[PDB]
DNA sequence: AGCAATTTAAATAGGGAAGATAAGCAAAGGGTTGACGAAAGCC
């Protein structure tokens, strides 16, 4: 399910971003979602504390 | 005690043999490098 997942994300810290300083330093935790660069094939990153979240039937 | 000459021509061709093989092993490791969240003493 997808809504189940979006809400699983929201019960947690719940950040979706296209740019971050988390890659520069893992202790940083700055997450930035730019709106202008979202396109058809724009890959999009997300953050959860310790990457938590349930999986689907396909894992 | 330096003086030692000039031109001219330097071979055309025919051949550079194929047949064989070119190992099989067994190794090639992991040891550290984790940030948030949550109890839990402690100024």
UniProtKB/TrEMBL annotation:
It comes from the Viruses. This is Uncharacterized protein. It comes from Vibrio phage ICP1_2004_A.
């Amino acid at each position: 399910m997808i809504k189940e997942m979006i809400e699983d994300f929201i019960s947690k810290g719940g950040l979706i971003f296209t740019h971050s300083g988390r890659y520069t330093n893992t202790n940083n935790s700055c997450f930035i979602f730019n709106k202008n660069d979202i396109g058809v094939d724009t890959k999009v990153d997300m953050y959860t504390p310790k990457s938590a979240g349930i999986k689907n039937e396909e894992g």
